[PDB]
């Protein structure tokens, strides 16, 4: 689990603070809807 | 792209001319050795390395 | 043009080499192209130029040098006389290593073309130039000195052959074999 | 090939030797290793220079180690009970840089001096086991010491 | 420039592997490859290198071909693997340097501003080191030799690597002070006595041989100048070196004595340790 | 159709290139393609290794560049002889030698491409000439699991394979893979040149000038002898001690060999004094 | 798409500086190379063209390539001054064609001679007999100036193509100014 | 072989060592120590080191891979 | 370089965080959100002048 803080135009490049680790610039997963992912929303990121 | 960065740390003391005890800023401490012309005179303890 | 260069070499043989600028014991003097052209220039003057560098005092050649070229030589005769005295001091050490390198004060007096009593004063002046670092003993004014720089080696480097080098090296390997014979089992 | 060579061991028939050479020249080491052992058995005790030359030459040119290992046993088998006839070959195999050829040389010491307490065979074996870094060659030397001392086995445990 | 030429061990092996790769054809008689290294300082260190296809012909040594595409494409791909890696010179086998080398050198000079030639020998011999370092420059000789363009020898060294001799040295090795002065003295006498004599012998032969085929016995100032530097010691007769008497001879006795007096004390410790070891410990009938 | 304890022969050049490339990319786990030779099932020898340019994707199959492989192969064809790549060689810094699901996905693609598909895992843990942290692994098929994974026709080779055994981390992910033995490929002149360049070059072998010697030696000889004078008191204690019950007496202070070697080698300088020179 | 690779030999010399052919002999030589590269490209895209000066230095200006862009760049800033050394260049060109990995492509050499060559006629004839054994077609277009009648080259071409051989045309420089198109027509008409 | 093995014992010490503090000796040839990380480990003491130095907690160099009291 | 840059930003170890300071031999010191400080001999792909402490 991690918490989103922002979103960007074109490739969203949502940047997420894990909870103590780092600000991670993670792209959305292939099998997800971009609209469903939202700024200021808790999200789950696969480490691998 | 080839360069891989260097841990920033402070020399706690000079164990020997070959090896100086240093502490990484994050906290784990490793005894370390100087590289080439590292000017050990300017590597006196209390210098960031 | 051989003749034009021989004419340039006539000047090189005369004022050009008479000038204190060139005196290298044949580094330039024994170079073949200029010396053959300088053969047209008086041979005795050309010989006198070699004589100052390696013949040192060459008192007979000193009389000859005035004959070889009155211009330049007369103007710098005192300075050149000093240079040959320095050349004589360098000559003993490089030409003779040990043994003959050590020589009497009187020979240095002849080498500096000065009186033997005067040479006690004169050797010090020649030693003073200190062109080459060495060890000098005034018991007989013998040289037996350390570092010296020869402009070129004499003859065909006969000292470099079995006269000094090479022959000694052959002796060493036989002694190296003696070390092997002394301790073959240890070599394993 | 392994069965035919064992069945024809000591016959020294030219036809079996030629067929074993055909398997040797097949260039397949697993079949070739069987052929190499068979080649040694058929010519065991032969002291045949031509056979030893063919095997040593093939071993030098054979890239596969498995063929070399089978050939190595074969070279020892051909030189059987020489006692001094194959000493030059034994020196050459020990001299050979390849470890498997050196192992064959230790085996050649054993076969040439089988049931012999000859000091010369023991001495060469003694130096190689200490000198050779390769463990397989060192192991081969110890095995060879047993074969030579079967005739006098009282001293066999002490070494 | 090119003050020293350290060559990494991996490159030293790479030349030998190429010789085996072209071992099928012995006609070339040499192995030629682009030498890639980093000019971190005046010291030049060779790193990973690749071999450009090249043919050397005995016909006037003018039939020489270097593939521009192979040199450019491989160097670019290798540079992609290492940013530090850059063309620093070229390497060839054939220990006697061919006359064609200078022409190949001019192409090498174009590719790298201060390139160097390393004459590594795939078949190693004895003495010194395998790589030979030569840099070709154009200048006016002070004495006056025409053209004065020739390769100049430069110091060469072996590079540092980790876990490299596990493949090779693990079988042997002799890292101890046990063999110091037991065989080490023998090697120096073996080469300084013979190899040092051989180079001097080449010059002594050159007194007539240099006249016959050499550039000149009286040539290359260092022939006499370096030899005279080697003759820092006089070389004959009085010498005044080991014949110093009050000087070196007296000192040799003081140090030899101080070194020797320990041995009498040394024997005492070793002998008594043996006496306790055998006279008491062995003698335990129980 | 049956696996065996096959031997992988690593040429010195391939091993040297792998560790050097691995050391450079140890932080980023660099990967490369191994130019091996499939001479026969029992023996596989990697004659050469080449390093893939660093790829952002990782050690994954996608990271490998098809265009780079084709052009590199063409260069190998023009100079010397090219060989079909046996498999992918790569470095995992965190776990000396280990296997991963990501690794198997690339390994499966290489297995589809050829047969042996050997994978090597070199790492930063190292020794000057005694580490060999590198290990080689080949996956075992789930369908093949019902059949014996590796039938052995030779007992001794299985015993040699048994000596490495398994690593505890490797044991955790061992299932679905089988370790394959790796041995150095035969080295002859290659061994000889490094051998010539070891004592003569890697170790100090000037030889012409190989032979401090009389300046600090007097200090070292006095200091070691002083240590012996204090140390010899412990042997003096042992001889005086009744020692009815065995007790440690700090004997074997030794240093006798160290003094003997130093004094004798310096005394051997007499050969330089009157024989090597005049 | 006939597969052929041509190691052309360009000439850079004080003679080439003369502009009797076109505004400049070098520019005309560059134009002649341009048409042959275009002709090879029309015949097959894979066709490789490579060129080098045969004067003073006879290395490889460009390795043979299907793309003609490298050929054009090498022609630019050719810089003319070196005395002609055709014998070394011709030997280099023949072996260079063998050097190419794609020997399947037909091997041909086109050369330009701007100055008389001071070589023994027997020596070039000996090379020409070796070239005949190599069986690589060579056609030479002399540019601006040449040895009178190119007698040594005419014998060299005959030795290269004797016994009902290809008889590749040898073009002696047309006296005075010559149009590049006039020079191009003879090779296009026949090898 | 003895000399080569003795060199190997010296070699483990030379590689960069993480700093550590000795805590307790369970038995000879073993120890419990806290590193700069602080995590307590069942490390093995090197044979050469004098045992008397080990008893005060002091500071003990730890091999990075082994964590042992180098 | 752009493809590597895109992959690295996307990757989990990008650890985007502020630069503690800017240095010259052209150099940067970055404290990652992991709270670990690293000095980079090369300031980076982005322009040194563009980067702000
Ligand atoms: Zn992997």
Swiss-Prot record, chain A:
<feature type="modified residue" description="N6-acetyllysine">
    <location>
        <position position="19"/>
    </location>
</feature>
<comment type="subunit">
    <text>(Microbial infection) Interacts with HIV-1 Tat.</text>
</comment>
<protein>
    <recommendedName>
        <fullName>26S proteasome regulatory subunit 7</fullName>
    </recommendedName>
</protein>
<comment type="function">
    <text>Component of the 26S proteasome, a multiprotein complex involved in the ATP-dependent degradation of ubiquitinated proteins. This complex plays a key role in the maintenance of protein homeostasis by removing misfolded or damaged proteins, which could impair cellular functions, and by removing proteins whose functions are no longer required. Therefore, the proteasome participates in numerous cellular processes, including cell cycle progression, apoptosis, or DNA damage repair.</text>
</comment>
<comment type="subunit">
    <text>Component of the 19S proteasome regulatory particle complex. The 26S proteasome consists of a 20S core particle (CP) and two 19S regulatory subunits (RP). The regulatory particle is made of a lid composed of 9 subunits, a base containing 6 ATPases including PSMC2 and few additional components. Interacts with NDC80/HEC; this interaction is detected only during M phase. Interacts and SQSTM1. Interacts with PAAF1. Directly interacts with TRIM5.</text>
</comment>
<comment type="similarity">
    <text>Belongs to the AAA ATPase family.</text>
</comment>
From Swiss-Prot, chain E:
<dbReference type="GO" id="GO:0000502">
    <property type="term" value="C:proteasome complex"/>
</dbReference>
<dbReference type="GO" id="GO:0016020">
    <property type="term" value="C:membrane"/>
</dbReference>
<dbReference type="Pfam" id="PF01398">
    <property type="entry name" value="JAB"/>
</dbReference>
<dbReference type="GO" id="GO:0005829">
    <property type="term" value="C:cytosol"/>
</dbReference>
<dbReference type="GO" id="GO:0005634">
    <property type="term" value="C:nucleus"/>
</dbReference>
<dbReference type="GO" id="GO:0043161">
    <property type="term" value="P:proteasome-mediated ubiquitin-dependent protein catabolic process"/>
</dbReference>
<protein>
    <recommendedName>
        <fullName>26S proteasome non-ATPase regulatory subunit 7</fullName>
    </recommendedName>
</protein>
<dbReference type="GO" id="GO:0005576">
    <property type="term" value="C:extracellular region"/>
</dbReference>
<comment type="similarity">
    <text>Belongs to the peptidase M67A family.</text>
</comment>
<feature type="modified residue" description="N6-acetyllysine">
    <location>
        <position position="200"/>
    </location>
</feature>
<dbReference type="GO" id="GO:0042803">
    <property type="term" value="F:protein homodimerization activity"/>
</dbReference>
<dbReference type="GO" id="GO:0034774">
    <property type="term" value="C:secretory granule lumen"/>
</dbReference>
UniProtKB/Swiss-Prot annotation, chain F:
<keyword id="KW-0647">Proteasome</keyword>
<dbReference type="GO" id="GO:0070628">
    <property type="term" value="F:proteasome binding"/>
</dbReference>
<dbReference type="GO" id="GO:0070536">
    <property type="term" value="P:protein K63-linked deubiquitination"/>
</dbReference>
<keyword id="KW-0378">Hydrolase</keyword>
<dbReference type="GO" id="GO:0000724">
    <property type="term" value="P:double-strand break repair via homologous recombination"/>
</dbReference>
<dbReference type="GO" id="GO:0046872">
    <property type="term" value="F:metal ion binding"/>
</dbReference>
<dbReference type="GO" id="GO:0061578">
    <property type="term" value="F:K63-linked deubiquitinase activity"/>
</dbReference>
<keyword id="KW-0597">Phosphoprotein</keyword>
<comment type="subunit">
    <text>Component of the 19S proteasome regulatory particle complex. The 26S proteasome consists of a 20S core particle (CP) and two 19S regulatory subunits (RP). The regulatory particle is made of a lid composed of 9 subunits including PSMD4, a base containing 6 ATPases and few additional components. Within the complex, PSMD4 interacts with subunit PSMD7 through their respective MPN domain. Interacts with TXNL1.</text>
</comment>
<dbReference type="InterPro" id="IPR056263">
    <property type="entry name" value="RPN11_C"/>
</dbReference>
<dbReference type="GO" id="GO:0022624">
    <property type="term" value="C:proteasome accessory complex"/>
</dbReference>
<keyword id="KW-0234">DNA repair</keyword>
UniProtKB/Swiss-Prot annotation, chain H:
<protein>
    <recommendedName>
        <fullName>26S proteasome regulatory subunit 6B</fullName>
    </recommendedName>
</protein>
<comment type="similarity">
    <text>Belongs to the AAA ATPase family.</text>
</comment>
<comment type="function">
    <text>Component of the 26S proteasome, a multiprotein complex involved in the ATP-dependent degradation of ubiquitinated proteins. This complex plays a key role in the maintenance of protein homeostasis by removing misfolded or damaged proteins, which could impair cellular functions, and by removing proteins whose functions are no longer required. Therefore, the proteasome participates in numerous cellular processes, including cell cycle progression, apoptosis, or DNA damage repair.</text>
</comment>
<comment type="subunit">
    <text>Component of the 19S proteasome regulatory particle complex. The 26S proteasome consists of a 20S core particle (CP) and two 19S regulatory subunits (RP). The regulatory particle is made of a lid composed of 9 subunits, a base containing 6 ATPases including PSMC4 and few additional components. Interacts with NR1I3. Interacts with PAAF1. Interacts with TRIM5. Interacts with ZFAND1.</text>
</comment>
């Amino acid at each position: 689990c991690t918490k989103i803080i922002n979103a960007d135009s074109e490739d969203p490049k949502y940047i997420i603070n894990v909870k103590q680790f780092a600000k991670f610039v993670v792209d959305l997963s292939d099998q997800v809807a971009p609209t469903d992912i939202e700024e200021g929303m808790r999200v789950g990121v696969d480490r691998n | 792209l080839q360069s891989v960065g260097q841990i920033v740390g402070e020399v706690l003391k000079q164990l020997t001319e070959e090896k100086f005890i240093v502490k990484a800023t994050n906290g784990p401490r490793y005894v370390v050795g100087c590289r080439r012309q590292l000017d050990k005179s300017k590597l006196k303890p209390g210098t960031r390395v | 043009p051989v003749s034009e260069q021989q004419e340039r070499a006539f000047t090189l043989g005369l004022a050009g080499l008479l000038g204190e600028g060139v005196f290298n014991f044949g580094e330039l003097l024994m170079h073949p192209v200029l010396e053959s052209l300088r053969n047209t220039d008086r041979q005795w003057l050309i010989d006198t130029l070699y004589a100052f560098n390696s013949g040192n005092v060459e008192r007979f050649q000193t009389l000859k040098t005035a004959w070889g070229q009155q211009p330049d030589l007369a103007a710098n005769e005192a300075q050149l006389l000093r240079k040959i005295q320095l050349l004589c001091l360098m000559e003993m050490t490089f030409t003779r290593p040990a043994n003959h390198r050590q020589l009497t004060f009187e020979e240095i007096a002849k080498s500096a073309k000065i009186t033997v009593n005067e040479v006690e004063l004169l050797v010090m002046k020649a030693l003073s130039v200190g062109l080459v670092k060495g060890s000098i003993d005034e018991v007989d004014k013998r040289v037996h000195m350390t570092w010296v720089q020869p402009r070129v080696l004499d003859l065909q480097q006969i000292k470099g052959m079995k006269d000094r080098l090479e022959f000694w090296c052959t002796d060493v390997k036989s002694m190296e074999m003696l070390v092997e014979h002394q301790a073959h089992d240890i070599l394993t | 090939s392994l069965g035919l060579g064992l069945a024809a061991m000591g016959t020294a028939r030219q036809d079996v030797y030629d067929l074993l050479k055909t398997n040797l020249y097949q260039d397949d080491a697993v079949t070739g290793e069987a052929a190499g052992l068979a080649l040694g058995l058929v010519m065991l005790g032969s002291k045949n220079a031509q056979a030893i030359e063919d095997m040593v030459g093939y071993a030098q040119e054979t890239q596969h180690e498995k063929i070399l290992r089978g050939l190595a046993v074969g070279i020892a088998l051909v030189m059987y009970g020489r006692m001094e006839e194959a000493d030059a070959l034994i020196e050459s195999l020990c001299r050979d840089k390849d470890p498997i050829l050196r192992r064959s040389g230790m085996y050649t010491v054993a076969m040439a001096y089988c049931g012999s307490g000859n000091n010369k065979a023991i001495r060469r074996l003694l130096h190689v086991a200490v000198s050779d870094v390769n463990d397989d060659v060192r192991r081969a030397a110890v095995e060879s010491l047993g074969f030579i001392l079967f005739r006098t086995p009282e001293q066999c445990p002490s070494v | 420039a090119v003050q020293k030429v350290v060559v990494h061990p991996l490159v030293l092996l790479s030349v030998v592997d190429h010789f085996n790769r072209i071992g099928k054809v012995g006609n070339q008689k040499r192995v030629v490859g682009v030498l890639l290294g980093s000019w971190q300082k005046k010291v030049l260190d060779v790193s990973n290198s690749f071999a450009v296809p090249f043919d050397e012909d005995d016909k006037d040594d003018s039939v020489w071909f270097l593939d521009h595409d192979y040199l450019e494409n491989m160097y670019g791909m290798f540079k992609k693997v290492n940013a530090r890696e850059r063309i620093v010179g070229w390497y060839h086998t054939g220990p006697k340097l061919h006359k064609n080398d200078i022409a190949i050198n001019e192409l090498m000079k174009r590719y790298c501003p201060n390139s160097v030639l390393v004459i590594i020998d795939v078949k190693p011999k004895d003495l010194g080191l395998p790589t030979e370092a030569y840099i070709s420059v154009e200048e006016v000789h002070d004495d006056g030799t025409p053209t004065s363009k020739t390769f100049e020898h430069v110091t060469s060294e072996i590079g540092a690597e980790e876990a490299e001799e596990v493949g090779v040295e693990h079988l042997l090795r002799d890292i101890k002070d046990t063999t110091v002065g037991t065989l080490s003295q023998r090697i120096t006498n073996q080469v300084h006595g013979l190899k040092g004599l051989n180079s001097k012998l080449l010059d002594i032969r050159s007194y007539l041989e240099k006249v016959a085929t050499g550039k000149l016995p009286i040539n290359h100032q260092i022939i006499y100048q370096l030899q005279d530097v080697f003759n820092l010691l006089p070389d004959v007769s009085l010498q005044e070196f080991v014949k110093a008497f009050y000087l070196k001879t007296n000192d040799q006795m003081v140090v030899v004595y101080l070194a020797s007096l320990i041995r009498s004390v040394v024997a005492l410790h070793n002998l008594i340790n043996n006496k306790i070891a055998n006279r008491d410990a062995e003698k335990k009938e129980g | 159709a049956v696996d065996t304890a096959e031997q992988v022969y690593i040429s010195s050049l391939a091993l040297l290139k792998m560790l050097k490339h691995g050391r450079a990319g140890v932080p980023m786990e660099v990967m490369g393609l191994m130019l091996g030779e499939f001479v026969d099932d029992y023996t596989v020898r990697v004659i050469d290794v080449f390093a893939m340019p660093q790829s952002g994707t990782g050690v994954s199959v996608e990271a490998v560049d098809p265009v780079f492989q084709a052009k590199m192969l063409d260069m190998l064809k023009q100079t010397g002889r090219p060989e079909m790549v046996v498999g992918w060689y790569h470095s995992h810094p965190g776990f000396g030698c280990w296997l991963s699901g990501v690794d198997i996905n690339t390994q499966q693609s290489f297995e589809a491409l050829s047969e042996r598909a050997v994978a090597v895992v070199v790492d930063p843990i190292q020794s000057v000439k005694g580490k060999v942290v590198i290990d080689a692994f080949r996956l075992i098929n789930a369908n093949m699991m019902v059949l014996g994974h590796e039938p052995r026709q030779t007992t001794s080779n299985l015993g040699h394979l048994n000596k490495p055994s398994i690593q505890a981390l490797i044991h955790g992910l061992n299932r679905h893979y089988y370790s394959i033995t790796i041995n150095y490929r035969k080295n002859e002149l290659e061994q000889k040149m490094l051998l010539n360049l070891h004592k003569k070059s890697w170790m100090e072998g000037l030889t012409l000038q190989d032979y401090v010697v009389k300046e600090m030696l007097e200090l070292a000889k006095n200091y070691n002898k002083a240590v012996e004078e204090e140390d010899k008191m412990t042997p003096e204690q042992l001889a005086i001690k009744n020692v009815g019950k065995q007790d440690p007496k700090r004997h074997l202070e030794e240093h006798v060999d160290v003094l003997m070697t130093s004094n004798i080698v310096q005394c051997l300088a007499a050969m330089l004094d009157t024989v090597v020179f005049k | 798409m006939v597969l052929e690779s041509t190691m052309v030999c360009v000439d850079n010399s004080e003679y080439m500086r003369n502009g009797d052919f076109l505004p400049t002999r070098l520019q005309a030589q560059q134009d002649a190379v341009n048409i042959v590269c275009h002709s090879k490209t029309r015949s097959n895209p894979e066709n490789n063209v490579g060129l080098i000066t045969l004067a003073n230095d006879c290395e490889v200006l460009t390795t043979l390539t299907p793309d003609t862009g490298r050929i054009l760049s090498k022609l630019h800033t050719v810089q003319p001054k070196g005395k002609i050394t055709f014998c070394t260049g011709i030997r280099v060109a023949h072996l260079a064609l063998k050097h190419r990995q794609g020997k399947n492509h037909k091997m041909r050499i086109i050369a330009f001679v701007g100055s008389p060559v001071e070589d023994n006629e027997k020596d070039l004839v000996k090379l020409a007999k070796r070239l005949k054994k190599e069986k690589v077609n060579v056609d030479i277009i002399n540019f601006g100036e040449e040895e009178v009648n190119t007698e040594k080259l005419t014998a060299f071409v005959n030795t290269l193509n004797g016994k009902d051989g290809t008889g590749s045309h040898l073009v002696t420089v047309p006296p005075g100014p010559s149009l590049a198109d006039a020079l191009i027509s003879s090779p296009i008409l026949a090898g | 072989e003895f000399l080569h093995a003795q060199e190997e014992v010296k070699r483990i010490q030379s590689i960069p060592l993480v700093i550590g503090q000795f805590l307790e000796a369970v038995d000879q040839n073993t120890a419990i120590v806290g590193s700069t990380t602080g995590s307590n480990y069942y490390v093995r003491i090197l044979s050469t080191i004098d045992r008397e130095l080990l008893k005060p907690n002091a500071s003990v160099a730890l091999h990075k891979h082994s964590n042992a009291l180098v | 370089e752009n493809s590597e840059k895109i992959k690295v930003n996307k990757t989990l170890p990008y650890l985007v965080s502020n630069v503690i300071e800017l240095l010259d031999v052209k150099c940067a010191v970055i404290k990652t959100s992991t709270r670990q400080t690293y000095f980079l001999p090369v300031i980076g792909l982005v322009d040194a002048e563009k980067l702000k402490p």
